[PDB]
Amino acid sequence: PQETLNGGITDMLTELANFEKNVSQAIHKYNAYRKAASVIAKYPHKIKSGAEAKKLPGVGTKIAEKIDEFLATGKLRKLEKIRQDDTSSSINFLTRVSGIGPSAARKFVDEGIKTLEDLRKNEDKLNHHQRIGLKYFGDFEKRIPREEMLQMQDIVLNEVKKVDSEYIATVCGSFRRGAESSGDMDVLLTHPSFTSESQPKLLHQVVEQLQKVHFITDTLSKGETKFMGVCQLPSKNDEKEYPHRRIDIRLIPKDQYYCGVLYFTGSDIFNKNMRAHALEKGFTINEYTIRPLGVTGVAGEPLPVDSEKDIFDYIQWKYREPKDRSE
DNA sequence: CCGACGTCGCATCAGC
DNA sequence: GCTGATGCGA
DNA sequence: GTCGG
Numbered sequence: 001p002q003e004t005l006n007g008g009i010t011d012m013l014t015e016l017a018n019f020e021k022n023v024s025q026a027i028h029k030y031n032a033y034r035k036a037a038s039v040i041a042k043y044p045h046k047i048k049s050g051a052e053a054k055k056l057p058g059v060g061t062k063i064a065e066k067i068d069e070f071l072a073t074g075k076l077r078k079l080e081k082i083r084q085d086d087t088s089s090s091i092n093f094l095t096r097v098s099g100i101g102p103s104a105a106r107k108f109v110d111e112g113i114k115t116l117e118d119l120r121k122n123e124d125k126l127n128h129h130q131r132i133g134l135k136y137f138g139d140f141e142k143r144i145p146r147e148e149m150l151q152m153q154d155i156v157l158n159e160v161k162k163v164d165s166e167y168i169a170t171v172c173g174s175f176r177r178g179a180e181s182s183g184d185m186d187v188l189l190t191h192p193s194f195t196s197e198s199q200p201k202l203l204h205q206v207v208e209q210l211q212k213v214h215f216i217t218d219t220l221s222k223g224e225t226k227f228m229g230v231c232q233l234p235s236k237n238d239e240k241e242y243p244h245r246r247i248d249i250r251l252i253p254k255d256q257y258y259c260g261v262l263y264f265t266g267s268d269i270f271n272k273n274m275r276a277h278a279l280e281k282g283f284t285i286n287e288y289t290i291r292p293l294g295v296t297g298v299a300g301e302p303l304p305v306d307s308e309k310d311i312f313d314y315i316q317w318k319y320r321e322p323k324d325r326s327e
Numbered sequence: 328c329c330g331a332c333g334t335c336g337c338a339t340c341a342g343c
Numbered sequence: 344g345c346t347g348a349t350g351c352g353a
Numbered sequence: 354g355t356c357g358g
């Protein structure tokens with residue numbers, strides 16, 4: 001559907017969701033509001049009452065009441081009050097910095113630190129991740145055009161193959177599903193020398209090369225299997241330079257790679273469906289392996305997977321392109 | 328009534 | 344110093 | 354906050 005259909009309601013619930021996660025530290029009440037926001041955003045009618053909305057999965061009594069108040073008054077008393085609360089709004093805002101969660105944002109505001117400005121005059125109280133998030137605060141809240149993602153893929157695939165041509169890299173996420181834009185770049189990486197029963201330098205050598213050609217600009221975290229950092233496309237000429245982008249590089253064992261590729265391709269809703277259907281066919285699916293359920297639920301050894309299709313076969317589904325995987 | 332509500336690698340903290 | 348908990352992201 | 358055993 002469209003925005004102005006129930007945008008005022010979905011925005012209200014989205015605001016409410018954030019305050020729950022960031023201020024109240026109620027992660028489950030955060031997901032509840034977002035789930036309610038989603039199902040309403042799919043509802044192809046301009047909602048007339050809270051009761052009409054209550055018919056939907058995810059909308060209970062409390063939200064029905066709030067929807068009633070919004071439709072009747074055009075606003076929400078509790079949300080209006082919390083928007084103008086100095087402490088709460090500042091705590092909620094500081095969490096927009098990557099690295100600063102609700103706990104760190106709590107401490108900052110507790111000791112006077114309320115703003116980006118305030119963060120800037122207090123570098124020594126920010127860890128490495130928080131500094132990067134502050135430095136690229138604006139760039140990280142921007143989306144990446146698909147064309148730029150394609151240019152970014154060109155670089156990743158080229159350099160990865162350059163390090164070792166037996167590497168297998170795959171850009172997953174919404175990009176692989178064909179989205180016109182992405183929020184980040186999730187790269188999944190494997191190599192013949194890396195199985196589950198199987199060096200610890202495979203991920204390091206790839207991150208290193210991407211730093212040597214100056215694609216990777218910063219590093220949020222890095223271990224033997226997962227890399228979280230920052231990257232940037234080269235500036236064309238005197239033309240304005242590209243924003244800094246979030247990139248994740250994951251080293252997954254060969255025998256788990258395609259369960260990894262399938263999982264990190266998405267979408268969420270699709271992964272819910274596929275696993276729900278997988279169970280009723282007698283198989284359990286996590287991000288790593290596909291295992292057969294016994295007659296009492298006792299899972300067996302993981303079944304060999306050498307392609308995405310292999311998984312679809314196991315649960316008797318026709319292999320569907322990432323293009324058609326929103327649900 | 329009352330627990331589930333996805334899971335886990337990495338950095339960094341609290342404790343010993 | 345080591346181990347395990349906690350915060351964070353996704 | 355919502356759902357459901």
Ligand SMILES: Cc1cn([C@H]2C[C@H](O)[C@@H](COP(=O)(O)NP(=O)(O)OP(=O)(O)O)O2)c(=O)[nH]c1=O
Nearest residue numbers: 173174182183184263264265266267268271353
């Ligand atoms: C957060 C999350 C991740 N995933 C696995 C599949 C999501 O589609 C996917 C990629 O996560 P993402 O990068 O946060 N979302 P996206 O890549 O589809 O799109 P965008 O780049 O964030 O705009 O990873 C889930 O299956 N359920 C989830 O709730």
Ligand SMILES: [Mg+2]
Nearest residue numbers: 173174184186
């Ligand atoms: Mg992505």
Ligand code: NA
Nearest residue numbers: 054056059060
């Ligand atoms: Na309901």
Ligand code: NA
Nearest residue numbers: 095097098100
């Ligand atoms: Na944050």
